[PDB]
Design an enzyme around this catalytic site. Structure first.
Site, mmCIF file in Angstrom:
data_model
loop_
_atom_site.group_PDB
_atom_site.id
_atom_site.type_symbol
_atom_site.label_atom_id
_atom_site.label_comp_id
_atom_site.label_asym_id
_atom_site.label_seq_id
_atom_site.Cartn_x
_atom_site.Cartn_y
_atom_site.Cartn_z
ATOM 1 N N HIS A 1 0.785 -1.224 0.000
ATOM 2 C CA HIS A 1 0.000 0.000 0.000
ATOM 3 C C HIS A 1 0.850 1.326 0.000
ATOM 4 O O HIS A 1 0.870 2.053 -0.982
ATOM 5 C CB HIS A 1 -0.970 -0.118 1.201
ATOM 6 N N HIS B 1 1.030 5.075 -2.896
ATOM 7 C CA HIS B 1 1.316 6.411 -2.469
ATOM 8 C C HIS B 1 2.694 6.929 -2.737
ATOM 9 O O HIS B 1 2.780 7.952 -3.361
ATOM 10 C CB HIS B 1 1.150 6.532 -0.983
ATOM 11 N N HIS C 1 -4.169 0.411 -6.252
ATOM 12 C CA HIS C 1 -4.438 1.056 -4.982
ATOM 13 C C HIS C 1 -5.763 0.597 -4.441
ATOM 14 O O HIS C 1 -5.807 0.307 -3.275
ATOM 15 C CB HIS C 1 -4.444 2.528 -5.104
ATOM 16 N N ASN D 1 -6.356 -1.204 -0.870
ATOM 17 C CA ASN D 1 -6.919 -0.277 0.114
ATOM 18 C C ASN D 1 -8.380 -0.507 0.557
ATOM 19 O O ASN D 1 -8.675 -0.425 1.747
ATOM 20 C CB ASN D 1 -6.826 1.158 -0.425
ATOM 21 N N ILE E 1 -7.085 8.599 -0.825
ATOM 22 C CA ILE E 1 -7.143 8.170 0.556
ATOM 23 C C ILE E 1 -6.274 6.878 0.356
ATOM 24 O O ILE E 1 -5.385 6.594 1.160
ATOM 25 C CB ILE E 1 -8.649 7.881 1.055
HETATM 26 FE FE LIG Z 1 -4.318 4.608 0.306
#
Ligand SMILES: [Fe+3]
Length: 836
Positions: free
Chosen positions: A497, A502, A688, A692, A836
């Site tokens: 993750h 990110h 992602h 997530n 997010i």
């Molecule tokens: Fe995330």
């Protein structure tokens, strides 16, 4: 001459600002109207003395437009008429000056025209601060996409200066109102000024802890160390990378920051005081977190109930209680999580469905350096393997591609000696699984290793655990799987993750804003895929991955979490992020032209992979049609100076610790660009999403996805084996994440697993009218209809009773790769970006 008729759409700060919106003809718009806001049009076809486009008259906003068909919530429109004629040529850009003082969000300008010239549209989407702050005025270009032939001659220099202004160079402390993109290393996570217990190592720019770069913020250096950066409660990002929202509630990063800056201190106050037990004592108490919840004191359910965003996240009941929603993993059966079948299934359709590999040789080997768990191997044996199934030898199982491995041995090993000196007590684990004739996977052996029996010179001290269905042996077995899960959670969080989505994506947003003009076709392709990313990362630097933070407090690797992910980054390869390459590298697929996507899967019923190939293909298809609409030949791409400088900086600076690796695509071919752009889109979108949005649905029950272990396996004769024998639920609970930290984890993963109501999905979804190129609009449409067809296709798979891995004993249909979603805790939806 003539008048060009203008329409300006903008949004008031008060309508998008977190401090105002909490809550969410009197007539406020009158203030935008006298001498408050000016616009000046720039010719695209007529030049000044030295090449530059000619400027119209700065013209002020003239009049409120009450209504239009396309207006939209929170938007205000304004009439404005530009004095212009045949000789001033055709407008291609404009300057805006805001003299007001309060900033506003400029959405668009529409010009209805003169000539046989149609309407010119400009999509701006930029906050306009007071004009005094600038020096050269805020410039916006029209709709028309252009390779850096840059294109219209009178606009060429304006195109280049905007980029020069955005790059800003690389000195100065960055301010709120600025739009300046640049790189720095992760030298800001520590707080050494508060003590050297809080110092953390710098990540990137060195060979021990290489790492991607992040957005430069230019604060002053710490007092105690001039290579670390002072902390701030306010982390800079180029303005405009920070998205605002019309609904209170959609400000998710606010909720995250408040969990820690507010909910945390005042959950201790009822622990560090005493209204609730400090530890769970049965599995029943963990399940009451979703039923009657935890009862809290009125003092502090009033401090953590009347705050922003967190209403629609914890459920109150009468008074006191802080309730949690029941995670999907327990909605049909509360006990299925303990099944061997579900433990193995989650490596294919779980929160971290990425890791499994096909066992090519036996026993498994380590890539660690000079000690022997590791030059040679794992201590799982052939007699450990085959119990109740089919009497193949290990060689035969291997030959027929039926043995698989989950290997968490090497990253934590070198840090085990250190992590095991904290409260945490952890193992380095490997797991071997077998594919049954029924097509489901079964765990056959778990190996639990510790360091340096004596030493760290021939080094593995390992024990092996085998399945057991009854008695103390089955509790021992459940503890073995938990030692595996705690390892998996942590790698999932820091690597699958954080690092892999990110962190790695951020340098691409910087490279892109710095070198590709907003008018560049590639800028438009990629742009939706960077939405809110730098913002979420800016906050994770502040509250998630920082010295005191939630990730260090929650997950297994503790204080070594982020440095450990930098060591993993030593193995990161850009082109192995593409899904098909990922599967082949792991032994989970083999190249095969017979098959639907040129790939034959080992394990056909691997949900993540089968659904992900569909999505991967659809993105690559869209990326191909787009890139080939704009690039006439491979030579055209070799000649694009914006694309080439962008790529150069990405490889040399942004992902600069890897600048000399051989696998980086050269942007010398149109295929290479499609491949790179597909990888970026994949990473930011579907990868992602896969890693997530299943965090709360699967790990919302701490029992199923514990984050850390705190006790070694009960031995032989000892009292804790006897306690195991007596109250195994309590022995399970003593081993995993304590109640306090469970509470914080749940709170964070709950917010992470939600979609904001204004999320923009892959689904064919984009912001407004981003290009006036009708071929691109059309191809984009074909991309959404494909996603819609794939959504049907995937829903049909979830109703195929022959695909047991899609549901499992948990009866939890794999829907994480369905493109559409409604919002909230859903177990689905692919956002365009890491938002997010
Ligand atoms: Fe995330």
């Amino acid at each position: 001459g003539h008048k060009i008729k203008g329409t300006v759409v903008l949004m008031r700060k008060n309508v998008l600002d977190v401090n105002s919106v909490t809550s969410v003809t009197l007539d406020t718009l009158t203030a935008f109207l006298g001498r408050s806001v000016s616009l000046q049009l720039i010719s695209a076809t007529k030049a000044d003395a030295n090449g530059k486009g000619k400027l119209g008259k700065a013209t002020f906003l003239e009049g409120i437009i009450t209504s239009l068909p396309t207006l939209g919530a929170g938007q205000s429109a304004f009439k404005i008429n530009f004095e212009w004629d045949d000789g001033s040529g055709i407008p291609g850009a404009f300057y805006i000056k805001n003299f007001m003082q309060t900033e506003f969000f400029l959405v668009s300008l529409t010009l209805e025209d003169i000539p046989n010239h149609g309407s010119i549209h400009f999509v701006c989407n930029s906050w306009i601060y007071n004009a005094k702050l600038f020096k050269s005025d805020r410039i916006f270009f029209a709709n028309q996409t252009y390779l850096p032939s840059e294109t219209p001659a009178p606009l060429v220099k304006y195109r280049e200066e905007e980029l020069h202004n955005l790059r800003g160079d690389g000195t100065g402390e960055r301010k709120e109102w600025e739009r300046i993109y640049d790189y720095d290393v992760y030298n800001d996570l520590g707080d050494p000024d508060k003590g050297e217990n809080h110092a953390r190592p710098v990540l990137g720019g060195n060979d021990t802890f290489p790492y991607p770069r992040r957005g430069r913020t230019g604060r002053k250096p710490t007092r105690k160390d001039p290579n670390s950066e002072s902390r701030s409660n306010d982390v800079y990002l180029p303005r405009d990378e920070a998205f605002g929202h019309l609904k209170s509630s959609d400000f998710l990063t606010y909720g995250l920051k408040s969990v820690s800056q507010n909910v945390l201190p005042l959950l201790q106050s009822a622990f560090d005081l005493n209204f609730t037990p400090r530890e769970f004592d049965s599995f029943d108490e963990v399940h009451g977190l979703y039923s009657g919840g935890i009862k809290l004191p009125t003092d502090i359910i009033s401090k953590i109930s009347p705050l922003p965003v967190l209403k629609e996240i914890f459920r109150t009941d009468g008074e006191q209680a802080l309730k949690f929603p029941p995670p999907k993993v327990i909605q049909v059966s509360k006990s299925a999580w303990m099944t061997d079948e579900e433990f193995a299934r989650e490596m294919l359709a779980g929160v971290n469905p990425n890791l499994i590999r096909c066992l090519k040789d036996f026993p498994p080997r380590s890539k660690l350096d000079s000690q022997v768990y590791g030059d040679h191997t794992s201590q799982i044996t052939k007699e450990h393997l085959e119990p109740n199934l089919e009497g193949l030898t290990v060689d035969e199982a291997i030959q027929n591609k039926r043995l698989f491995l989950l290997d968490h041995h090497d990253p934590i090993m070198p840090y085990l000696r250190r992590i095991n000196a904290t409260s945490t007590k952890a193992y380095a684990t490997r797991t071997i699984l077998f594919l049954k004739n029924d097509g489901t996977l079964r765990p056959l052996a778990i190996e639990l290793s510790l360091p340096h029996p004596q030493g760290d010179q021939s080094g593995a001290f390992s024990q092996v655990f085998l399945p057991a269905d009854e008695g103390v042996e089955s509790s021992i077995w459940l503890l073995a799987k938990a030692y595996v899960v705690v390892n998996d959670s942590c790698y999932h969080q820091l690597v699958s993750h954080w690092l892999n989505t990110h962190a790695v994506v951020e340098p691409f947003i910087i490279a892109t804003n710095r070198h590709l003009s907003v008018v560049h076709p590639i800028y438009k392709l990629l742009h939706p895929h960077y939405r809110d990313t730098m913002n979420i990362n800016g906050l994770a630097r502040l509250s998630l991955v920082n010295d005191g933070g939630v990730i260090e407090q929650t997950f297994l690797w503790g204080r070594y979490s982020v440095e450990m992910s930098a060591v993993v980054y030593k193995d990161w390869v850009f082109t192995d992020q593409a899904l098909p390459a990922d599967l082949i590298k792991r032994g989970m697929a083999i190249e095969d032209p017979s098959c639907p996507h040129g790939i034959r899967l080992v394990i056909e019923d691997y949900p993540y992979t089968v659904d992900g190939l569909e999505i991967w293909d659809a993105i690559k298809t869209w990326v191909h049609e787009y890139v080939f609409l704009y690039y006439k030949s491979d030579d055209t791409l070799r000649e694009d100076p914006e694309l080439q400088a962008c790529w150069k900086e990405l490889v040399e600076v942004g992902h600069g610790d890897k600048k000399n690796e051989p696998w980086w695509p050269k942007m010398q071919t149109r295929e290479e660009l499609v491949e790179a752009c597909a990888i970026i889109i994949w990473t930011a979108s579907a990868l992602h999403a896969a890693v997530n949005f299943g965090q709360y649905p699967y790990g919302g029950l701490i029992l199923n996805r514990p984050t850390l272990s705190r006790r070694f396996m009960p031995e032989k004769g000892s009292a804790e084996y006897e306690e195991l024998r007596k109250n195994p639920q309590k022995a399970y609970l003593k081993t995993i994440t304590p109640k306090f930290q469970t509470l914080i984890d749940l709170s964070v993963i709950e917010i992470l697993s939600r979609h904001a109501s204004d999320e923009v999905y892959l689904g064919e979804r984009d912001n407004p009218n981003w290009t006036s190129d009708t071929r691109a609009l059309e191809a984009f449409k074909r991309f959404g209809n494909k996603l819609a067809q794939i959504e049907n296709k995937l829903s049909e798979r979830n109703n195929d009773e022959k695909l047991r891995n899609r549901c499992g004993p948990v009866q939890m249909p794999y829907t994480l790769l369905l493109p559409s979603s409604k919002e909230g805790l859903t177990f689905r939806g692919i956002p365009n970006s890491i938002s997010i």
